[PDB]
Amino acid sequence: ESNFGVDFVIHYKVPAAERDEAEAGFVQLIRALTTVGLATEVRHGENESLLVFVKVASPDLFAKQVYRARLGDWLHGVRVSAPHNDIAQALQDEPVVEAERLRLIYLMITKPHNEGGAGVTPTNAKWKHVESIFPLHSHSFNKEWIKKWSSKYTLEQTDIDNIRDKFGESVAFYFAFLRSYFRFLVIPSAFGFGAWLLLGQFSYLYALLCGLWSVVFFEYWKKQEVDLAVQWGVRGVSSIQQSRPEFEWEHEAEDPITGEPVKVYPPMKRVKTQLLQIPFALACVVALGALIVTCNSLEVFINEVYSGPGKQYLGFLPTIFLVIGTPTISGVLMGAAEKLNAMENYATVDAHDAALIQKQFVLNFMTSYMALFFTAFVYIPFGHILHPFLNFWRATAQTLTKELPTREFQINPARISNQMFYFTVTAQIVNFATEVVVPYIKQQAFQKAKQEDHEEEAEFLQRVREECTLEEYDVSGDYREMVMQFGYVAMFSVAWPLAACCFLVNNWVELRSDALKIAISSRRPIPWRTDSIGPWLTALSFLSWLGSITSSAIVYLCSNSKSPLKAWGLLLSILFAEHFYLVVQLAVRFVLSKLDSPGLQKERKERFQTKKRLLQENLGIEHSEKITREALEEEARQASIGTPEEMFWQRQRGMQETIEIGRRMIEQQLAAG
Amino acid sequence: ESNFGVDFVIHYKVPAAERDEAEAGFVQLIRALTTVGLATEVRHGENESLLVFVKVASPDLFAKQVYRARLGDWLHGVRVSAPHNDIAQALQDEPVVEAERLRLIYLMITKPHNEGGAGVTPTNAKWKHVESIFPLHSHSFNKEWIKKWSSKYTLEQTDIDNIRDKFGESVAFYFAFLRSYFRFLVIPSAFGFGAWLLLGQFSYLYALLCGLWSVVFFEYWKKQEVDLAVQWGVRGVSSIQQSRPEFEWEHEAEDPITGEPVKVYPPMKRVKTQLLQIPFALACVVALGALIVTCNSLEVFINEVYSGPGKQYLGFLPTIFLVIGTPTISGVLMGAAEKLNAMENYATVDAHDAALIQKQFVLNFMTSYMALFFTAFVYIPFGHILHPFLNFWRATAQTLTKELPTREFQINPARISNQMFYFTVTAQIVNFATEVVVPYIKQQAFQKAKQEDHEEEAEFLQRVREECTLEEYDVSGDYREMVMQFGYVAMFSVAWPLAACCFLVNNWVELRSDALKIAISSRRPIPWRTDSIGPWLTALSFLSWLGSITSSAIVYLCSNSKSPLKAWGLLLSILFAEHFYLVVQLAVRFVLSKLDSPGLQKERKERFQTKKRLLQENLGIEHSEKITREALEEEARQASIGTPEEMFWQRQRGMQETIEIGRRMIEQQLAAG
Ligand SMILES: [Ca+2]
Ligand SMILES: [Ca+2]
Ligand SMILES: [Ca+2]
Ligand SMILES: [Ca+2]
């Protein structure tokens, strides 16, 4: 039914040929683990492997290792609350959760062996045969988790705080971002259903309301992110996570924050190499932008200028030419993104994978909006610039198949509504069939491909050999869906104002669809820590900025197709609705700064009560005669040896002499006049 | 020669008629001071007043009052360094400076009498007769300060750190802003003398270089401001300064940061009233903007369309009509700014005077740039819109003085060079005669208007009666010059690129001119504390933003007067050179974040060494048998009562059994195939 107390499982693939270092490396693995302090087992693998099963042996030593890592966080400003002074009592105050238990075990297994437990890092390449280090699922918990989340309409902060406890924080920021995005998507579904009903399409009032929402939501998430990063105690872990073994370093100095010597790469040698992605991000706009346009210039040739045979047969020819082409060019540019990401020499492993996202955001910008930036800006306002393109495909179809019958070219203004219907209805359904249904069918193809084991543990070992074949849950992958989906709302939703009503329905499925993908279709992720969503905050801030320029260039260029377009009107329509974005950015950033922040106030209270605790530890008529005694003493100590200095103060000592000379000098100053 | 140890001097004006409450209030003053712990004297005033002379009586009580206010700052996160544990030894570690001595005396004199010393606040209105509370100058220090600062070309950080020690921090941020602005003004004086020599006037390359500098300088000052606010220990005093007696409050709760009960005004009731200055800032643009234009539309009538008598006599008629008018309309709008500033109900006294600046920035924007916004944008590009204006002053001059001889109207493109020559050369000289020379002459008019005193202190009392007549140094006043002077560099310097070469010469005088104004022409200011320059950071950030729009609309509208102007070219010239400002804002904000910050690292080191001090106080082969002993114990404690759980771990205990079954299960898995 349940796991047998098993913390982690290491796979350790052994090949038939070249088993000479796999057998001796198994000795080098199974005895390196026991020096850390964790017991082991070995069972039969799937075909040709050795699942070893580790658990921490003595909890009286592990309870001292949680406390040694709780103080290690609290010294670094991560935890706002200090642990309790009595050892083995702070665990009774706050328990150890299943995320903090598996994280410190994984830091014991993966470490450079000089500062922690051991190294079973697969990138060390001496442990080449170590295939996967993964924790087991809790199938009595996943059965309740899908049941509890499907029997409720809205979620609750307590229902995310038990995803923090078991799947770490890096997973539980996604479900806390998706909940705080499905609830903010009611607001463009409020007036978006309004401006589809009352106003016409391409309404300027909706293009301002959806510029206000995209900065109300984004600046409220940054205020909700430092409330979760305090309450979960994950406040600023960007400088704490373990460095990389491939981190080359120029020289080694001392850390001015801490004192311990660290490896130092000079940052102005890194900004010179980080600058080199400006010709990269221009090259990805050029390369992938030339494929989507050439595919769409052919797709407008088959549909709009054609009369020959097979209009529906040849209509699927561009879409085949895209989905074969677009992973080939993306695979080449990722070969240039990866060979540039190692050249930038990132220190922490969390800031190396968070720069592979910003170098893959440009590849996943052009593949999702150049199909719409070509329709809304080139095709629908002034599409007669395509006559070089539509004469090329005539001359491409003359030499292949007599004159081919081609009709006259006419701009169809419904192409912006057909393409937004695909990206908001069809490409959300077929994404749901790809996310959930297709891997759920793929286990039946593993069922077709189905061993001297023991009969007591036979049901449990049948599950672990099944669980090894699944892929690790890439939580950066599901952020990429909910940020591109933010793009169609911020940028292109003015062209189809129901596009927030068919994402609110999809996100409420996606809040449970992605919860299904953790349970049945992926192994349990290693519980990492993040303080933010990462490099998506610079991707939500870019689409929300662009979503005030292209959501107002659409409402000018495309509304006149339902007068000539003049260039002074467009550049004024950009200038007002981008400055309105920058003004309402400054209004929301000023209003939310005036609100009560229960994250920093929980932090700045414990910082104050630390010093007030430190203060009370070390520090545990009658005043007028103190005035007189020191005044006569100053004359007494200068009576031995002055004349213009201390004889100035001794004339009016005390106060009763002072009011006497004070009152006598009032009539003496007023009887003269 | 020097003051006789006198800390402060209270003036206490007493009138002839209504002396009934001045005599009894003098008793209520001179005995309220002695309950605090400071000695007093009374001497003859100037004509009809009573200068009382206070000093702290016993330094053994004052040394405990500095320490009670050093811990009061360190508990609030102001001071990054805790004081020494031994009492009367932290004064030997760091001494008490003359700014921190006079500040705690002024907090003893001015306080609500329930939490501190006493109340001699003149706004209490029971101490109505108390005129001025001021500390005396050190005329042996001012003689060296002008000598040391005039005998050097460049200044030094040590030469500002002894202005922190004696004139407080609120003065010494001005001299540290003026030094960090005169040194950054070399850079537009570098290529500004270049682009005046090499390129022509209205050069677009200078309009980008002066948009880059205005964000390099502004984002380097914000990095230099948290380096001074740590080193001087003034880190974040915005929530520490004393509240106002006129602060009305709705209810009283507890402070979540501290715990002590405070008076609470709900901030969303304040943002509703702070929003009301948007019709105010529109009204100041309308009111003062209609005076400067009507004055300039008359000034272009006398100079450009006129042939009658007295062209130089009538030419000074608009400038007389401005300098009489513009303080009358400004005095009315400040009557509306002050009656709105009390309606916003600010808590601290430092945030009440820092919102009177932002409500006087609009009055001091239009009075300094509407003379140039009318020339550069209305007169010089397309000035034939002034023909309604230039026909009005014809009909105004027909009915006053036969037909008047008027010549033909022609646009003179040298008006942008004549007006920038006034604002950069003439209005800096005549500002220097107004700042220094005119008050230095005004003491000779006090010498013409020149008493039963004592002959020993007669030279000292002759100086204090002279020093009472001076005005308090308003350090907000000299910021207003160096921010308007930043405006002509950021906005209008592209029209006259030598305008940075005649401000670099002026600032090097102003760095010593304003140092002369503290010594001889103003009394010593009370040493307050600020963490920033205040509301000028939102005024430098606005002029540097506007200085990428109007410094690029000038270079398009005015360069063609040396082709027709098209509106699509202007809105594109704004859109590129404002987005270039927002891009180079993001480059400088990212580069300077990667640099080493010695302010926060001095703060985040002492915060770490506090907890490491707190940690060491309370906390002051062989491992494989610990694995074995707990594994046999877990079977031992379950031997009494399981079968699928603990009998899973006991099969391979230790590690030598594990490699034995591990190696035997390698050939058993590979001899089958
Ligand atoms: Ca989906
Ligand atoms: Ca997803
Ligand atoms: Ca001046
Ligand atoms: Ca000045």
Short mmCIF file of C-alpha atoms in Angstrom, two decimals, chain B residues 250-564:
data_model
loop_
_atom_site.label_atom_id
_atom_site.label_comp_id
_atom_site.label_asym_id
_atom_site.label_seq_id
_atom_site.Cartn_x
_atom_site.Cartn_y
_atom_site.Cartn_z
CA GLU B 250 -9.05 58.07 13.77
CA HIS B 251 -8.17 55.25 16.16
CA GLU B 252 -5.18 53.85 18.04
CA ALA B 253 -3.85 50.31 17.64
CA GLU B 254 -0.54 48.66 18.42
CA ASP B 255 2.49 48.92 16.16
CA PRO B 256 3.21 45.47 14.65
CA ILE B 257 6.88 46.35 14.13
CA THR B 258 7.44 47.58 17.70
CA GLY B 259 4.48 46.92 20.01
CA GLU B 260 3.99 50.38 21.47
CA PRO B 261 0.61 52.01 20.69
CA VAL B 262 0.67 54.63 17.94
CA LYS B 263 -1.86 57.00 16.40
CA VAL B 264 -3.21 55.51 13.18
CA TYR B 265 -4.63 57.30 10.14
CA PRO B 266 -5.87 54.80 7.52
CA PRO B 267 -3.77 55.26 4.38
CA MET B 268 -6.59 54.65 1.91
CA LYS B 269 -8.31 57.68 3.42
CA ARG B 270 -5.13 59.63 2.61
CA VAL B 271 -4.71 58.47 -0.99
CA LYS B 272 -8.23 59.77 -1.69
CA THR B 273 -7.03 63.21 -0.56
CA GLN B 274 -3.56 62.90 -2.10
CA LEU B 275 -5.33 62.27 -5.42
CA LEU B 276 -6.80 65.79 -5.22
CA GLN B 277 -3.48 67.37 -6.22
CA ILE B 278 -4.03 66.17 -9.80
CA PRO B 279 -6.55 69.03 -10.32
CA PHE B 280 -4.06 71.18 -8.40
CA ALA B 281 -1.08 70.37 -10.63
CA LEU B 282 -3.30 70.94 -13.65
CA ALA B 283 -4.36 74.31 -12.21
CA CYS B 284 -0.76 75.44 -11.69
CA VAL B 285 0.06 74.55 -15.29
CA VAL B 286 -2.97 76.57 -16.41
CA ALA B 287 -2.52 79.60 -14.14
CA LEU B 288 1.24 80.19 -14.27
CA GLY B 289 1.41 78.90 -17.84
CA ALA B 290 -1.04 81.58 -18.93
CA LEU B 291 1.08 84.30 -17.34
CA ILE B 292 4.46 83.31 -18.82
CA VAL B 293 3.00 82.93 -22.32
CA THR B 294 1.06 86.21 -22.19
CA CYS B 295 4.22 87.91 -20.96
CA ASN B 296 6.25 86.26 -23.72
CA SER B 297 3.62 86.98 -26.37
CA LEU B 298 3.98 90.62 -25.37
CA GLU B 299 7.77 90.38 -25.29
CA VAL B 300 7.76 89.09 -28.86
CA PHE B 301 5.43 91.96 -29.80
CA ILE B 302 7.76 94.70 -28.58
CA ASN B 303 10.90 93.17 -30.06
CA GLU B 304 9.76 91.57 -33.30
CA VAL B 305 6.74 93.58 -34.48
CA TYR B 306 7.32 97.24 -33.61
CA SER B 307 8.85 100.35 -35.18
CA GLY B 308 7.64 103.15 -32.91
CA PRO B 309 9.43 105.07 -30.18
CA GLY B 310 11.21 103.54 -27.22
CA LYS B 311 11.93 99.99 -28.36
CA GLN B 312 14.41 99.53 -25.51
CA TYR B 313 12.23 101.48 -23.07
CA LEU B 314 9.12 99.39 -23.77
CA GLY B 315 11.19 96.21 -23.99
CA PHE B 316 11.54 96.05 -20.21
CA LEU B 317 7.75 96.37 -19.76
CA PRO B 318 7.04 92.58 -19.95
CA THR B 319 9.85 91.68 -17.53
CA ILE B 320 8.42 94.17 -15.03
CA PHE B 321 4.97 92.69 -15.67
CA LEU B 322 6.30 89.20 -14.89
CA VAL B 323 8.29 89.77 -11.68
CA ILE B 324 5.37 91.65 -10.14
CA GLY B 325 2.80 89.13 -11.34
CA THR B 326 4.59 85.81 -10.81
CA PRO B 327 4.98 86.12 -6.99
CA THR B 328 1.32 87.15 -6.69
CA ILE B 329 -0.11 84.11 -8.48
CA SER B 330 2.46 81.87 -6.77
CA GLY B 331 1.39 83.25 -3.40
CA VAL B 332 -2.24 82.42 -4.15
CA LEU B 333 -1.54 78.85 -5.28
CA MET B 334 0.65 78.32 -2.22
CA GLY B 335 -2.38 79.41 -0.22
CA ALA B 336 -4.16 76.52 -1.90
CA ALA B 337 -1.19 74.18 -1.53
CA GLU B 338 -0.94 74.88 2.20
CA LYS B 339 -4.68 74.53 2.76
CA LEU B 340 -4.48 71.18 0.95
CA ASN B 341 -1.31 70.00 2.69
CA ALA B 342 -3.02 70.21 6.07
CA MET B 343 -5.98 68.29 4.64
CA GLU B 344 -3.77 65.30 3.85
CA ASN B 345 -2.90 64.92 7.57
CA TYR B 346 0.71 63.78 7.48
CA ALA B 347 2.07 61.89 10.45
CA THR B 348 5.73 62.81 10.68
CA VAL B 349 6.96 66.38 10.43
CA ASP B 350 9.56 65.40 7.83
CA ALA B 351 6.87 64.01 5.51
CA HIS B 352 4.77 67.14 5.87
CA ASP B 353 7.50 69.48 4.66
CA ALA B 354 8.42 66.96 1.95
CA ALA B 355 4.95 67.19 0.45
CA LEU B 356 5.02 70.98 0.44
CA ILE B 357 7.96 70.60 -1.95
CA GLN B 358 6.11 68.37 -4.43
CA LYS B 359 3.23 70.85 -4.33
CA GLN B 360 5.71 73.68 -4.95
CA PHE B 361 7.62 71.81 -7.63
CA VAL B 362 4.83 72.51 -10.11
CA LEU B 363 4.90 76.22 -9.26
CA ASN B 364 8.68 76.16 -9.74
CA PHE B 365 8.46 74.12 -12.92
CA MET B 366 6.28 76.54 -14.88
CA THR B 367 8.15 79.61 -13.66
CA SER B 368 11.45 78.23 -14.99
CA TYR B 369 10.61 76.32 -18.18
CA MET B 370 7.44 77.81 -19.67
CA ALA B 371 9.65 80.63 -20.92
CA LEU B 372 11.60 77.94 -22.80
CA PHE B 373 8.74 75.58 -23.65
CA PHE B 374 7.07 78.50 -25.42
CA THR B 375 10.19 79.43 -27.38
CA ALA B 376 11.35 75.97 -28.41
CA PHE B 377 7.94 74.45 -29.19
CA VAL B 378 5.64 77.27 -30.27
CA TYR B 379 7.80 80.19 -31.37
CA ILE B 380 10.77 78.70 -33.22
CA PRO B 381 9.26 75.63 -35.10
CA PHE B 382 5.91 77.11 -36.24
CA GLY B 383 5.45 80.59 -34.83
CA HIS B 384 2.74 81.78 -37.20
CA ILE B 385 0.17 80.44 -34.74
CA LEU B 386 0.99 83.61 -32.76
CA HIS B 387 -0.89 85.77 -35.27
CA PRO B 388 -3.98 85.80 -33.02
CA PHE B 389 -1.62 86.96 -30.28
CA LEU B 390 0.30 89.47 -32.39
CA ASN B 391 -2.95 90.94 -33.71
CA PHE B 392 -4.26 91.34 -30.17
CA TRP B 393 -1.34 93.51 -29.08
CA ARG B 394 -1.76 95.60 -32.22
CA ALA B 395 -5.37 96.27 -31.20
CA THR B 396 -4.11 96.78 -27.64
CA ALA B 397 -1.63 99.39 -28.87
CA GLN B 398 -4.07 101.09 -31.25
CA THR B 399 -6.49 102.01 -28.46
CA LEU B 400 -3.70 103.31 -26.20
CA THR B 401 -1.28 105.26 -28.39
CA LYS B 402 -3.25 107.19 -35.95
CA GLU B 403 -1.84 103.82 -37.01
CA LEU B 404 1.19 102.51 -35.12
CA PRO B 405 4.08 101.45 -37.39
CA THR B 406 4.48 97.66 -37.15
CA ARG B 407 6.97 95.73 -39.26
CA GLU B 408 6.42 92.27 -40.72
CA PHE B 409 6.66 89.24 -38.44
CA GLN B 410 9.60 86.92 -39.11
CA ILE B 411 10.76 84.00 -36.98
CA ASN B 412 14.13 84.72 -35.41
CA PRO B 413 15.77 81.33 -34.72
CA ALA B 414 18.36 82.88 -32.37
CA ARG B 415 15.76 83.28 -29.62
CA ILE B 416 16.54 79.81 -28.29
CA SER B 417 20.20 80.85 -27.97
CA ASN B 418 19.47 84.20 -26.35
CA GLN B 419 17.16 82.65 -23.76
CA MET B 420 19.55 79.83 -22.91
CA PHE B 421 22.31 82.41 -22.50
CA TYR B 422 20.23 84.15 -19.85
CA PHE B 423 19.39 80.98 -17.91
CA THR B 424 22.97 79.67 -17.92
CA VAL B 425 25.19 82.78 -17.65
CA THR B 426 23.19 85.82 -16.55
CA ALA B 427 20.75 84.10 -14.19
CA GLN B 428 23.68 82.33 -12.52
CA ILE B 429 25.59 85.56 -11.92
CA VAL B 430 22.56 87.49 -10.67
CA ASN B 431 21.65 84.47 -8.56
CA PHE B 432 25.13 84.67 -7.04
CA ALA B 433 24.59 88.36 -6.29
CA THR B 434 21.24 87.51 -4.70
CA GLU B 435 22.48 84.52 -2.69
CA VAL B 436 25.63 86.04 -1.18
CA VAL B 437 26.19 89.71 -1.97
CA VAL B 438 22.69 91.07 -1.26
CA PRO B 439 22.41 89.63 2.30
CA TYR B 440 26.03 90.67 2.88
CA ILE B 441 25.05 94.25 2.05
CA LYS B 442 21.91 93.93 4.22
CA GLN B 443 23.96 93.76 7.43
CA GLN B 444 25.28 97.25 6.70
CA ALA B 445 21.66 98.41 6.68
CA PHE B 446 21.55 96.79 10.12
CA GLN B 447 24.76 98.65 10.98
CA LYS B 448 22.96 101.96 10.41
CA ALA B 449 20.24 100.98 12.91
CA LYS B 450 22.66 100.54 15.84
CA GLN B 451 23.08 98.79 26.74
CA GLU B 452 23.57 98.22 30.51
CA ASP B 453 25.41 94.93 29.89
CA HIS B 454 28.49 93.45 31.56
CA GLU B 455 31.90 94.20 30.07
CA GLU B 456 33.40 90.69 30.22
CA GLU B 457 30.76 89.01 28.05
CA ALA B 458 30.09 92.14 25.99
CA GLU B 459 31.76 90.88 22.82
CA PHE B 460 29.94 87.55 23.05
CA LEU B 461 26.51 89.05 23.69
CA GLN B 462 27.06 91.52 20.86
CA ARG B 463 27.34 88.54 18.52
CA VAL B 464 24.28 86.62 19.75
CA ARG B 465 22.05 89.68 19.41
CA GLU B 466 23.36 90.00 15.85
CA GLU B 467 22.86 86.29 15.13
CA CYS B 468 19.20 86.33 16.18
CA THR B 469 18.21 88.61 13.30
CA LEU B 470 19.35 86.17 10.60
CA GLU B 471 16.94 83.70 9.02
CA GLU B 472 17.12 79.94 9.51
CA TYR B 473 18.93 78.05 6.78
CA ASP B 474 16.30 76.41 4.57
CA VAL B 475 18.26 73.53 3.02
CA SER B 476 15.26 72.74 0.84
CA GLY B 477 15.88 76.10 -0.80
CA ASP B 478 19.32 75.28 -2.17
CA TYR B 479 18.19 71.90 -3.45
CA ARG B 480 15.66 73.76 -5.58
CA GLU B 481 18.44 75.59 -7.38
CA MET B 482 20.49 72.46 -8.14
CA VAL B 483 17.42 70.59 -9.45
CA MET B 484 16.19 73.36 -11.75
CA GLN B 485 19.81 73.62 -12.90
CA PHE B 486 19.61 69.90 -13.61
CA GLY B 487 16.53 70.66 -15.67
CA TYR B 488 18.31 72.92 -18.16
CA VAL B 489 20.96 70.24 -18.64
CA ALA B 490 18.57 67.32 -19.08
CA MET B 491 15.82 69.05 -21.07
CA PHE B 492 17.09 72.11 -22.92
CA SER B 493 20.86 71.69 -23.17
CA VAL B 494 20.67 70.19 -26.66
CA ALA B 495 19.71 73.64 -27.96
CA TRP B 496 22.91 75.16 -26.54
CA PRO B 497 25.55 72.50 -25.82
CA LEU B 498 27.84 74.80 -23.83
CA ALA B 499 25.20 74.87 -21.07
CA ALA B 500 27.11 72.21 -19.15
CA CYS B 501 30.38 74.14 -19.33
CA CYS B 502 28.87 77.20 -17.63
CA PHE B 503 27.21 75.14 -14.91
CA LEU B 504 30.37 73.25 -14.00
CA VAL B 505 32.05 76.60 -13.33
CA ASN B 506 28.99 77.78 -11.41
CA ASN B 507 28.69 74.64 -9.28
CA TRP B 508 32.33 74.89 -8.21
CA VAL B 509 31.48 78.37 -7.00
CA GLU B 510 28.16 77.15 -5.54
CA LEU B 511 29.97 74.45 -3.57
CA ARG B 512 31.78 77.30 -1.80
CA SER B 513 29.11 79.99 -2.18
CA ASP B 514 26.60 77.93 -0.22
CA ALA B 515 29.33 77.12 2.29
CA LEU B 516 29.70 80.87 2.75
CA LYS B 517 25.95 81.20 3.30
CA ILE B 518 26.03 78.88 6.32
CA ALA B 519 28.86 80.82 7.95
CA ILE B 520 28.10 84.52 7.63
CA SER B 521 24.54 84.89 6.31
CA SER B 522 22.42 82.38 8.26
CA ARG B 523 22.19 81.02 11.77
CA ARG B 524 23.28 77.45 12.43
CA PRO B 525 20.53 74.99 11.46
CA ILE B 526 19.22 72.45 13.95
CA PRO B 527 21.00 69.17 13.12
CA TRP B 528 18.23 67.00 11.67
CA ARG B 529 18.58 63.58 10.06
CA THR B 530 17.45 62.42 6.63
CA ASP B 531 18.20 59.19 4.81
CA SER B 532 17.79 60.71 1.33
CA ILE B 533 17.52 64.09 -0.29
CA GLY B 534 13.80 63.47 0.01
CA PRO B 535 11.21 64.51 -2.57
CA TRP B 536 13.91 65.65 -4.98
CA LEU B 537 14.53 62.06 -6.01
CA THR B 538 11.10 62.13 -7.61
CA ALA B 539 11.99 65.52 -9.10
CA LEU B 540 15.33 64.44 -10.56
CA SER B 541 13.64 61.34 -11.94
CA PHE B 542 10.92 63.39 -13.62
CA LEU B 543 13.21 65.93 -15.31
CA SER B 544 15.45 63.10 -16.48
CA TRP B 545 12.41 61.40 -18.00
CA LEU B 546 11.05 64.58 -19.56
CA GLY B 547 14.61 65.32 -20.68
CA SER B 548 14.36 62.48 -23.18
CA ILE B 549 11.09 63.70 -24.66
CA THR B 550 11.64 67.45 -24.88
CA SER B 551 15.33 67.06 -25.64
CA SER B 552 14.35 65.05 -28.71
CA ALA B 553 11.32 67.08 -29.75
CA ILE B 554 13.61 70.12 -29.85
CA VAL B 555 16.18 68.43 -32.11
CA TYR B 556 13.42 67.64 -34.61
CA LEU B 557 11.29 70.79 -34.45
CA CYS B 558 14.17 73.27 -34.38
CA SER B 559 16.85 71.66 -36.57
CA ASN B 560 14.80 72.22 -39.73
CA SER B 561 14.94 76.00 -39.16
CA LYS B 562 18.71 75.95 -39.79
CA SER B 563 11.98 70.66 -45.25
CA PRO B 564 8.56 70.81 -43.60
#
